[PDB]
Amino acid sequence: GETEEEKRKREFEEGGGLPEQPLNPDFSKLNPLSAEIINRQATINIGTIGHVAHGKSTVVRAISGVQTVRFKDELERNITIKLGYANAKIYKCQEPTCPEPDCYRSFKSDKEISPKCQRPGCPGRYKLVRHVSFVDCPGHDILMSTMLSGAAVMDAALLLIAGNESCPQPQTSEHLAAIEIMKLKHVIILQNKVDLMREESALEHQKSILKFIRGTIADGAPIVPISAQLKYNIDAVNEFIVKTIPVPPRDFMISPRLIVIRSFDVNKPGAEIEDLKGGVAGGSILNGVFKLGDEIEIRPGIVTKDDKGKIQCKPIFSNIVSLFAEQNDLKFAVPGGLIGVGTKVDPTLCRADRLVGQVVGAKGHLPNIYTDIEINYFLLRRLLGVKTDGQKQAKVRKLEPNEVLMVNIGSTATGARVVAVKADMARLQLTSPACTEINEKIALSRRIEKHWRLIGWATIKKGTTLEPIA
Amino acid sequence: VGLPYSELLSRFFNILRTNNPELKFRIPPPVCLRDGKKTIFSNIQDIAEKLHRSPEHLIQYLFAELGTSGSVDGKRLVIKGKFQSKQMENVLRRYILEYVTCKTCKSINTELKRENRLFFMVCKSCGSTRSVSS
Amino acid sequence: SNYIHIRIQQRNGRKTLTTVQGVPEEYDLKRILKVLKKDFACNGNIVKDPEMGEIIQLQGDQRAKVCEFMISQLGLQKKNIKIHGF
RNA sequence: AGCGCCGUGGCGCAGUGGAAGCGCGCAGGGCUCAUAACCCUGAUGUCCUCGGAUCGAAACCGAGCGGCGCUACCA
RNA sequence: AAAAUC
Ligand SMILES: Nc1nc2c(ncn2[C@@H]2O[C@H](COP(=O)(O)OP(=O)(O)CP(=O)(O)O)[C@@H](O)[C@H]2O)c(=O)[nH]1
Ligand SMILES: [Mg+2]
Ligand SMILES: [Zn+2]
């Protein structure tokens, strides 16, 4: 006769709950699979891609259970602009008796270390093999800056295809190709509509998709039939995630850095402002741990245009007040995840889409901002994301001087002007600043049909730097 | 490799055949009583029941479509106008296509809810989040 | 949003009036009333109705004809525009 | 989530502090040969619910509800 | 004056 809350609390207290991370553990013995890390912070960022109106957030809600906050009363229904973040924990059943496909289970991040197996008749306890962060990239043909920023954030991929619709969806191919542009190859194929398909039709669809992914760089892409609605074949997805995708190399031997992709202002209205919190920049940490209380600087920061039209860039210095990596504030941070670094930054810097795709460095390092950038660029044969009713899918042309091109340098979305074009290299003038740390893998999109269409990939080889003014 | 994909396809087809042996043609013929100047629908209760829709939402939809303000008697929708049966049939079909049945699946199992304050349709067999409010 | 529909109002001696409610502002209204008048030989009014909007009232009882003008002038949909029997 | 607007007798506005208003409707009648126009007649309410100063309140306030509007998705 | 139908 126990209530649901009482049963949940009993399972939580049986399983150990969520132990607090040690304040200053020995970081030379701390792998991404340690209990202090695995139980309370993500180490792998896996992201979902698919064409418009497919249920990209619904599949992640099925896997994890946490909503992406599809906001704005107009993005409620059609498309989101900002990404959809989600946390799920991969738990395997320790008893060999239960079937291997059903051994795995993705739960919410509120779960404990050892939850009991919900399978009827199984007394085993679940072991957390990994907790993974989820990134959802909107797939609309005007909003591609967010998808490329996410791809720069990405570490693992999940591609989605609809059944009853046409096999060659341009947007799914665009997402795939953009993923292989960003040095990403762990891609898993997901067919969502199997419930509304027949025995034979899904076979021709899978044949067409197999023929589709034959010449692209990624070859070993497993295919998973899922249901965002019937909520089945989820444990198989988790098993494939754990097996096929290992951890990209990441340790604590590299200097810290941050790539802020979202802006979040903690301004709970109605209450007195005598009790407020810090302004939070949501960013991916691709390298370098952070600990509770640090001095950091957003390198692009203040961008002003003086009385001559010249650009002045002041890094935004800030002391880190909190690190909302997970539901409870953590003492440290782990590379390869999304963390909300809450500093003393004024919340209006985080109110709107302002801290979108910017680069941030800890004190003791000086990431260099650049105004003119030398770029080595390679291009694809034909445009992608365009539907052609049977006539020679449009071929990507060559660049021309003095034109605006959306140059997504990792997360930074800039409209660059091409000063010169060579056989493989070009010079870009940026009206919006970008800072070059190591390589910052670039993607390029050209305005050919009104909206942007991706063209190819690029790498920074040189640049013309600007000195920050403290 | 697509070999371990057909096994999960077959398992999913098995679970569908176990769970949904049915997989609407459950639209009652609309009965429109013409009484001089008055147009009566003594069957709108059955329309609401068979379409799994609350009556007042259906009335709101009808009077957002048509330019009238009519009353309800206890179970029956009575209005004062000269309205044909074809119009009632077509508004029922439009309500079915845009509200009642899923626009991505063949299902009526959705019902009416309010997610910040707007009507946000949610299903029961599939549970997909799609919403139409006009 | 912005649905389009036409209504008929009768009068004494079988004479009738037609109203299209909701008109896109991409093309202006006087330039459209000019060519309504010739193709229809009926009087027309750009009347203001509160909480309703600008209405191009026309004489006669014509629905396929205003629709046939709509298909050519600005309308490219022929799905949102609704025809009322009455 | 926060602050602005509203609460019919079918619909709107008005009074808000002597306790049920008007027009629009609806119904009937009269005008007439006959339709509009016009002229008469009605029958519908804790004017959203719960408390309070008040001889008194639907009205003045408030402790909550429903629907609209802006801030804006507010880690 | 406004006048309508037929
Ligand atoms: N048949 C079916 N419909 C689904 C499924 N998931 C979502 N839908 C429906 O299809 C639409 C897509 O869902 P939604 O989550 O809004 O799409 P999205 O993938 O977020 C859109 P984008 O790709 O542009 O980011 C919705 O209207 C929803 O009702 C699914 O698994 N099956
Ligand atoms: Mg989304
Ligand atoms: Zn559905």
Q: Which residues line ligand 1 (CB under 6 A)?
A: A 50-58, 79, 138-140, 192-193, 196, 227-229; B 104-105, 128, 130
Question: Could you tell me which residues are beta bridge partners of residue C17?
Answer: C9, C59
With beta carbons less than 8 A apart as the criterion, state whether A166 and A199 touch.
no
- CA contacts within 13 A on the Cβ side of B92: 22
Looking at the structure of chain C, the number of domains it has is 1
- Length of chain A equals 470
- The CATH code belonging to domain A367-462 is 2.40.30.10
Per-residue burial over A222-255, b = 16 or more CB atoms within 10 Å of its CB, e = otherwise: bbbbbbbbbebbbbbbbbbbbeebeebebeeeee
Contact A70 B128 (CB under 8 A): no
Q: Closest nucleotide to residue C15 (Cα to C1')?
A: E5
- DSSP-derived letter for residue B97 is I
Q: If DSSP codes are grouped into helix, strand and coil, which group holds residue B109?
A: coil
Q: If DSSP codes are grouped into helix, strand and coil, which group holds residue A447?
A: strand
What stretch of H or E contains A104? strand A104-108
The tokens for C62 are 């014509």
With CA atoms as reference, the chain B residue closest to C1 would be B134
- Length of chain B equals 134
Nearest of A292, A288, A284 to residue A257 by alpha carbon:
A288
Q: How far apart, in whole angstroms, are the C-alpha atoms of residue B67 and residue B79?
A: 11
Q: Which of B22, B118, B126 to mutate to test the interface with A (most CBs of A within 10 A)?
A: B126
Q: How far apart, in whole angstroms, are the C-alpha atoms of residue A449 and residue C22?
A: 31
Task: Please name the amino acid found at residue B83.
Answer: F
Q: How far apart, in whole angstroms, are the C-alpha atoms of residue B97 and residue A5?
A: 40
Neighbours of chain B (3+ CB pairs under 8 A): A, C
With beta carbons less than 8 A apart as the criterion, state whether A48 and A88 touch.
no
Query: Which CATH number characterizes residue C77's domain?
Result: 3.30.780.10
Q: Which residues contact A251 (CB under 8 A, 6 or more apart)?
A: none
Q: Provide DSSP, A278-340.
A: -EEEEEEE-S---BSS-EEEEEEEEEEE-TTS-EEEEEEEEEEEEEESSSS--SB--SSEEEE
CB nearest to B82's CB, from C1, C3, C86: C86
Residue whose Cα lies nearest atom 6 of ligand 1: it is A55
With beta carbons less than 8 A apart as the criterion, state whether A260 and A358 touch.
yes
Q: Closest nucleotide to residue B70 (Cα to C1')?
A: D10
Choose which residue among B16, B23, B129 to substitute to test ligand 1 binding: the one with the highest number of ligand atoms within 8 A of its C-beta.
B129
Q: Which residues contact A3 (CB under 8 A, 6 or more apart)?
A: none
With beta carbons less than 8 A apart as the criterion, state whether C85 and C18 touch.
no
Q: How far apart, in whole angstroms, are the C-alpha atoms of residue A225 and residue A195?
A: 10
With CA atoms as reference, the chain B residue closest to C83 would be B87
Nearest of A141, A115, A112, A111 to residue A126 by alpha carbon:
A115
Per-residue burial over A42-62, b = 16 or more CB atoms within 10 Å of its CB, e = otherwise: bbbbbbbbbbeebbbbbbbbb
Angle at C20 between CA C42 and CA B61, to 5 degrees: 155
Q: Name the fold adopted by A251-366.
A: Elongation Factor Tu (Ef-tu); domain 3 (2.40.30)
Q: If DSSP codes are grouped into helix, strand and coil, which group holds residue A417?
A: strand
- Length of chain C equals 86
With beta carbons less than 8 A apart as the criterion, state whether A457 and A443 touch.
yes
Q: How far apart, in whole angstroms, are the C-alpha atoms of residue C44 and residue C58?
A: 4
Helices (H), C3-82: 30-40, 64-73
The tokens for A205 are 């669809």
Range of the domain at C65: 1-86
Q: How far apart, in whole angstroms, are the C-alpha atoms of residue C63 and residue A327?
A: 61
With beta carbons less than 8 A apart as the criterion, state whether A137 and A51 touch.
no
CATH class, domain A41-250, is alpha beta
Preceding residues of all breaks in chain B (C to N beyond 2.5 angstroms)? 23, 74, 115
- C3 CB neighbours in chain B (<8 A) are 134
- C-alpha dist (Å) from residue B50 to A43, A398, B101, B102, B108: 50, 60, 12, 15, 10
User: What are the E-state strand segments in C1-86?
Assistant: 4-10, 16-21, 44-49, 53-59, 81-83
Q: How far apart, in whole angstroms, are the C-alpha atoms of residue A42 and residue A128?
A: 12
The tokens for A463 are 């640049």
Q: Where are the domains of chain A?
A: 41-250, 251-366, 367-462
Q: Which of B104, B131, B133 to mutate to test the interface with A (most CBs of A within 10 A)?
A: B104
- C-alpha dist (Å) from residue B78 to A256, B37, B59, B84, C62: 72, 11, 11, 14, 29
Q: If DSSP codes are grouped into helix, strand and coil, which group holds residue A242?
A: helix
Q: How far apart, in whole angstroms, are the C-alpha atoms of residue A54 and residue A144?
A: 17
Residue B65 CA to D44 C1' — how many Å? 28
